[PDB]
């Protein structure tokens, strides 16, 4: 009835009776109204490295590394380049696969 | 710079805003910012650093956007981060 | 019958690699003004 | 009438608007008649078909489809505007047959 | 400051696959 | 207060081309009408060339040919884009008919009428534009369809009497010819201004049928990225033809200078006659075959009225699906037997894919749609 918190930069505001000690409705019940939600559907996960630069050794930070609950196999576990190489690796393959049927289909043909 | 005076020294009216203050300036802050160091603070922004500022958060980002009505005629995501830079300053 | 071949020839590789180096450009560009598009996920919530 | 069974639910199986959530009565070509009818639908009709076409626009823009476990059944095939648009075609057969006399 | 590059890189490759039969490789011949 | 929406030129062009709402679903078939309209500014521009150094007297005619393709630097050049740039804008407008056809695009009406005016004239000047380089087979198409106009009674006379404008071969026919052609191609951007004007008001088909007003988006920056992509596509495959290849579509023998006397062993005219020339290989009557081709032609204006099916686009119509497919299946034949010769057995071939044309056209596809009304419950 004399200080509510409100006003977008978080600060205990004026409001009324039955505004701020009565922040519930009069409503009898929760009617038949449309529903709500506040839940980004997009599934995004940030996995954080954070390394050490010194030590020499590098193992055991690789091993935190690599035991990771992600659900990736571990040739796509490094992220960018892994993914990148294993992209044109099987794109290169699949062109060279296509190219030998027709090379030897052109071979199987005389002249 | 004199509406964000008005704004630090007429809200701590009374006792439950100074008290408001207090909390969170003990929960966040680690302490009391006292109000003259509030007004020191604000002493030194000039045109400058207002811009060096405001460029450094407000151009060339990428925003949130929030929407709820009729918002059929609100852009598309292109047209708001187009419209956060300019073409040649 | 054709005194214009080698002329010919030098404009279409400097049209190909002219071509080769402006298209993945033009590509990509599509490809992030329509993944702002192809990255929206919708959904109903009627009032039942 | 097993041979026209089967054959429907293979022509509504290979008709493709039910990979896309779709109903039949989405599909219709928008005339006077069927915007007339669509006019006369309840607002939660109305609600359900503008979602499900604003679902299949977007769906064939990525140029992908529903998978399989939620595609629109042949036994939930709904029928909703059918009798709105066979009221618009009696009446607009109505007047036209009032104009001729 | 690119496409002059771009024109002498595309004629250089164009004599480095056609060597001996353009008129620019016999130009010590009679001049 | 912004120049977008206060400024009547920013106003017409916001209006027109930027905030325009598209349906988010047309496939890269929607890019080919507007790359119809800057094949036409490529030829506009080539057609200013050519109105540089060309004359329109015969056999100096022929020679001023001869000077384009040597005496002026990058003069082939031209003459090989607006050769190449014919082939591609039959190809894009090809497309674009087939397109109209496909995706229930002809409930539009009167943009159907402005468009099959535009195939009606796009047709006469690639025809008479191919009669101005003056070769044999020029001559002998331009004697052909001239011959064919004079079999009408009564009004081909005087239209071979102002087009030929004498008793023989003379200076006045190409002068009216390179007239004709210069004029037509500007009144062809007119129809096309209307064209898209008569777009405006109704807005875009979506590949789906539907209506596509619960999902719409700016056509900038979408579908001008999208259209500067085909556009980039469309020139390097024009230019590929242009300086790779100049003369595989090209008939070889226009390229000798044209003779009265002698008569040719195969007279064919471009690819994109040679069905239409199949038709006139189909049936043998002269006013019967005018009448064959003007209504191959008009049939695409008559068939928006018949449209029986309560659907609009074949997406989702499996047998008309099939009838589309074998009818450009057909029409692939009709262009094929057009540039063979007339002998066993193309004949027969030619004359029954013209009458299976003729009904996958007109008859079928009634019963089609109403065989397609019936598998889904909804006819009488
Ligand atoms: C093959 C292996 C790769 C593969 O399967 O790729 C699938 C992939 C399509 O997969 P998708 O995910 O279903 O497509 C959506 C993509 O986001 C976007 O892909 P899209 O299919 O929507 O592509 C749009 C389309 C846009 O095409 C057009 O706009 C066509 C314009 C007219 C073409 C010419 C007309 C005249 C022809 C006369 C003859 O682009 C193309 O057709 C190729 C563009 C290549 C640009 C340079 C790339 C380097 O195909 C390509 O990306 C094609 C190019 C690479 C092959
Ligand atoms: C036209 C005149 C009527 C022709 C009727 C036969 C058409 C072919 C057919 O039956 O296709 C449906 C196919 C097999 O039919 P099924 O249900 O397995 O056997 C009962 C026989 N109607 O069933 C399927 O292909 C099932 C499709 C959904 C899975
Ligand atoms: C070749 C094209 C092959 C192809 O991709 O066909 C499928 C496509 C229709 O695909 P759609 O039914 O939309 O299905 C999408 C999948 N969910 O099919 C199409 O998009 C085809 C659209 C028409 C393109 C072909 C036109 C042929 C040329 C006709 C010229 C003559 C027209 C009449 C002149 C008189
Ligand atoms: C039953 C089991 C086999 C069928 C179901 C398995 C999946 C088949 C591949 C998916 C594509 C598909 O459904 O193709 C069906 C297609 C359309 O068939 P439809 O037009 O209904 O009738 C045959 C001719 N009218 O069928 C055809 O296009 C085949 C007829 C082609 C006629 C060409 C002339
Ligand atoms: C108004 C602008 C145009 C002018 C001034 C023009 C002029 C000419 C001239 C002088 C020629 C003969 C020289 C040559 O063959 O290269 C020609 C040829 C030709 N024009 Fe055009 N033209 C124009 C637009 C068009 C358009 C829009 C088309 C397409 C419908 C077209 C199709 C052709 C064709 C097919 C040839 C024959 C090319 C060949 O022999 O291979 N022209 N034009
Ligand atoms: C003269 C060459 C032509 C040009 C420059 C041209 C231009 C255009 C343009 C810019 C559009 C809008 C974009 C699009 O949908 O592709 C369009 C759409 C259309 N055109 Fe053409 N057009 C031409 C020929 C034709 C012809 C011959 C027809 C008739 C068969 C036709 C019928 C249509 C239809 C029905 C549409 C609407 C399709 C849709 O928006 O989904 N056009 N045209």
Redesign the pocket.
């Known amino acids: 009835m004399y200080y509510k918190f409100s006003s977008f930069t978080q600060k205990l505001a004026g409001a009324w009776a039955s505004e701020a000690y009565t922040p519930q409705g009069l409503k009898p019940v929760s009617t038949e109204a449309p529903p709500i939600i506040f839940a980004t559907p997009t599934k995004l996960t940030s996995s954080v490295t954070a390394y050490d630069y010194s030590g020499k050794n590098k193992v055991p930070e690789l091993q935190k590394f690599f035991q990771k609950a992600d659900g990736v196999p571990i040739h796509l576990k490094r992220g960018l380049p892994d993914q990148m190489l294993y992209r044109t690796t099987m794109a290169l393959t699949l062109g060279g696969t296509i190219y030998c049927l027709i090379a030897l289909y052109m071979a199987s043909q005389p002249r | 710079k004199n509406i964000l005076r008005n704004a630090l020294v007429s809200h701590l009216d009374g006792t439950t805003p100074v008290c408001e203050d207090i909390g969170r300036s003990l929960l966040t802050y680690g302490r009391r910012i006292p109000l003259a160091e509030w007004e020191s603070r604000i002493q030194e922004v000039d045109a400058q650093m207002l811009r060096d500022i405001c460029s450094k958060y407000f151009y060339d980002q990428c925003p949130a956007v929030a929407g709820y009505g009729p918002i059929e005629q609100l852009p598309d995501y292109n047209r708001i981060r187009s419209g956060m830079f300019w073409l040649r300053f | 019958s054709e005194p214009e071949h080698d002329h010919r020839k030098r404009m279409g590789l400097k049209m190909l690699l002219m071509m080769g180096l402006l298209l993945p450009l033009t590509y990509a560009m599509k490809r992030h003004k329509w993944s702002v598009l192809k990255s929206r996920k919708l959904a109903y919530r009627p009032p039942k | 009438s097993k041979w026209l069974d089967g054959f429907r639910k293979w022509y509504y199986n290979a008709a493709g608007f039910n990979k896309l959530g779709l109903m039949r009565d989405d599909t219709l070509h928008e005339t006077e008649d069927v915007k007339e009818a669509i006019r006369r639908l309840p607002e939660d009709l109305y609600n359900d078909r503008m979602f499900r076409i604003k679902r299949a626009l977007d769906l064939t823009m990525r140029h992908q489809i529903l998978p399989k476990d939620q595609w629109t059944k042949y036994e939930e095939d709904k029928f909703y505007l059918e009798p709105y648009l066979k009221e618009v075609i009696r009446e607009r057969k109505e007047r036209e047959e009032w104009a001729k006399k | 400051f690119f496409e002059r590059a771009f024109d002498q890189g595309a004629d250089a490759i164009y004599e480095h696959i056609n060597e001996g039969k353009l008129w620019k490789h016999i130009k010590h011949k009679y001049e | 207060t912004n120049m977008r929406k206060t400024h009547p030129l920013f106003k017409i062009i916001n209006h027109s081309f930027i905030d325009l709402p598209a349906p988010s679903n047309i496939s890269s078939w ?5 790359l ?2 800057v094949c ?1 500014m490529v030829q506009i521009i080539t057609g200013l060339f050519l109105a540089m150094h060309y004359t329109s007297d015969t056999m100096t005619a022929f020679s001023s040919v001869t000077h384009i393709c040597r005496d002026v630097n990058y003069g082939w050049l031209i003459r090989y884009m607006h050769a190449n740039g014919a082939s591609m804008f039959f190809i894009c ?1 090809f497309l ?2 087939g ?2 056809l496909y ?1 229930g ?2 409930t ?1 009406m009167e ?2 009428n402005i ?2 005016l ?2 009606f004239a ?1 047709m006469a000047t690639a025809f008479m534009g191919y009669v101005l380089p003056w070769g044999q087979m020029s001559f002998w198409g331009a004697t052909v369809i001239t011959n064919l106009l004079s079999a009408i009674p009564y009004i081909g006379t005087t239209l071979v009497e102002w087009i030929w404008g004498g008793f023989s071969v003379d200076k006045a026919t190409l002068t009216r010819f390179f007239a004709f052609h210069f004029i037509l191609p500007f009144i ?1 951007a007119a129809l ?1 201004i209307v ?2 004007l008569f ?1 405006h008001e109704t807005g ?2 979506n590949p789906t049928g539907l209506n596509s007003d619960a999902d719409k988006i700016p056509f900038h920056p979408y579908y001008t990225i999208k259209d500067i992509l085909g556009i980039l596509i469309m020139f390097l495959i024009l230019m590929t033809l242009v300086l790779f290849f100049p003369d595989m579509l090209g008939d070889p023998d226009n390229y000798m200078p044209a003779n009265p006397l002698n008569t040719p062993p195969h007279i064919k005219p471009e690819w994109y006659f040679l069905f239409a020339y199949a038709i006139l290989r189909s049936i043998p009557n002269k006013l019967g075959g005018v009448l064959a081709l003007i209504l191959s032609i008009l049939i ?1 204006a008559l068939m928006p009225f018949l449209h029986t099916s309560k659907q609009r686009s074949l997406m989702f119509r499996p047998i008309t699906q099939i009838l589309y497919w074998i009818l450009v299946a057909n029409l692939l034949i009709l262009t094929w037997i057009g540039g063979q010769p007339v002998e066993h057995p193309f004949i027969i071939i030619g004359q029954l894919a013209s009458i299976s044309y003729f009904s996958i056209i007109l008859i079928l596809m009634p019963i089609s749609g109403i065989i397609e009304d019936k598998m889904l419950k909804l006819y009488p």
Do not use: E, K, P, Q
Request: charged share 5%; hydrophobic share 55%; proline share 0%.
């Open positions: 929607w890019n080919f009408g507007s119809l309209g036409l407008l674009h008919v397109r109209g995706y695009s002809y539009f943009t159907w468009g099959v535009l195939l796009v062809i096309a064209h898209l777009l875009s088909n695409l």
